[PDB]
């Protein structure tokens, strides 16, 4: 079913009806006028960040290149393969860019320190996929450029999601959400879920340990805030 959308909810309402019970929600009217929303574009990103080295996930492999190289090879014209500038603390690397975002006010409802919030960039072409997985903190995923299809499964459904059998990968599902092998993973079929298309200016709250799967529908840039 579709993740609910709420316009600038009060801190207390967000706390009591979403944060405490661990229910996903899309926050509207919160990040829609952050400077990033109008400023970020390929040319702006090239100008500020183009010369800096970033990690890039290819496919599968992990490599390093400049932001300019990443754009040239994996976004513009006709890329040969899928590349994704994923899960990278770009704003620690480039303080000038950090000026264009801010910490959502709702994070102050947490028990953690603002200092310790981890801010990651997620920048890539249409078609990037983050396989179904869960993270150990709360998340606000802020969509800046393009749209993403997102599937969400509650931590209560973990037994239908066939986590990998190693410590290192136990927070990742073995299932390919959009083409599941139901012969091998039959329990996946019956597990309920939420989904949405997250659009520019919107924030998705992903509760701590909620399983999420994400596919970019367009050239996309998202910023996540992992907080407690």
Residue 134 backbone dihedrals phi, psi, to 5 degrees: -130, 155
Give the residue carrying structure tokens 């092998």: 181
- Tell me the window of 15-23, 88-96, 134-142, 160-168 that interacts with ligand AKG (CB under 6 A): 134-142
- The reply, when asked if residue 17 is annotated as ligand binding, is no
As for the chain, the residues directly before each break of C–N over 2.5 Å are: 59
- The reply, when asked if residue 87 is annotated as ligand binding, is yes
Q: Is 141 in the site for ligand AKG (CB under 6 A)?
A: yes
Tokens encoding 163 = 């986590």
Question: What is the smallest separation between the CB atom of 92 and ligand AKG, expressed in angstroms?
Answer: 16
Residue of 134, 106, 127 lying closest to 31 (CA atoms): 106
- Tell me the window of 13-21, 101-109, 129-137, 145-153 that interacts with Co ion (CB under 5 A): 129-137
Q: Choose among Co ion, ligand AKG, none what residue 140 binds, the Cβ cut-off being 5 to 8 Å by kind.
A: none
CA 203 – CA 32 distance, rounded (Å) = 9
Burial 153-186 (b: 16+ CB within 10 A, else e): bbeebbebbbbeeeeeeeebbbbebeebeeeebe
Question: What is the smallest separation between the CB atom of 135 and Co ion, expressed in angstroms?
Answer: 4
CA 25 – CA 21 distance, rounded (Å) = 12
Positions in 133-162 near Co ion (CB under 5 A): 135
Q: Choose among Co ion, ligand AKG, none what residue 214 binds, the Cβ cut-off being 5 to 8 Å by kind.
A: ligand AKG
Annotated binding site for a protein: 57, 87, 130
Query: What residues line the site for ligand AKG (CB under 6 A)?
Result: 122, 128, 130, 135, 139, 141, 212, 214, 222, 224
Q: Which residues bind Co ion (CB under 5 A)?
A: 135
């Amino acid at each position: 079913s579709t993740v609910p959308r709420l316009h600038r909810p009060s801190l207390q309402h967000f706390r009591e009806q979403f944060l405490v019970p661990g229910r996903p929600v899309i926050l509207k009217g919160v990040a829609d006028h952050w400077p990033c929303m109008q400023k970020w574009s390929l040319e702006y990103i090239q100008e500020i960040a183009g010369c800096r080295t970033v990690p890039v996930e290819v496919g599968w492999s992990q490599t390093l290149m400049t932001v300019n190289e990443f754009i040239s090879k994996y976004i513009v014209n006709e890329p040969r393969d899928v590349g994704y500038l994923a899960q990278h603390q770009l704003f620690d690397q480039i303080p000038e860019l950090k000026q264009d975002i801010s910490i959502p006010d709702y994070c102050s409802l947490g028990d953690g320190e603002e200092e310790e919030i981890t801010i990651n960039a997620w920048f890539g072409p249409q078609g990037t996929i983050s396989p179904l997985h869960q993270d150990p903190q709360q998340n606000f995923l802020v969509q800046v450029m393009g749209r993403k299809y997102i599937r969400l499964y509650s931590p209560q459904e973990s037994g239908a999601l066939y986590p990998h059998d190693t410590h290192l990968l136990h927070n990742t599902s073995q299932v390919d959400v959009e083409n599941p092998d139901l012969e091998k993973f039959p329990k996946f079929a019956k597990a309920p879920f939420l989904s949405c298309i997250l659009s520019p200016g919107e924030i998705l709250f992903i509760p701590v340990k909620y399983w999420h799967y994400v596919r970019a529908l367009d050239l996309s840039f998202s910023v996540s805030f992992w907080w407690s």
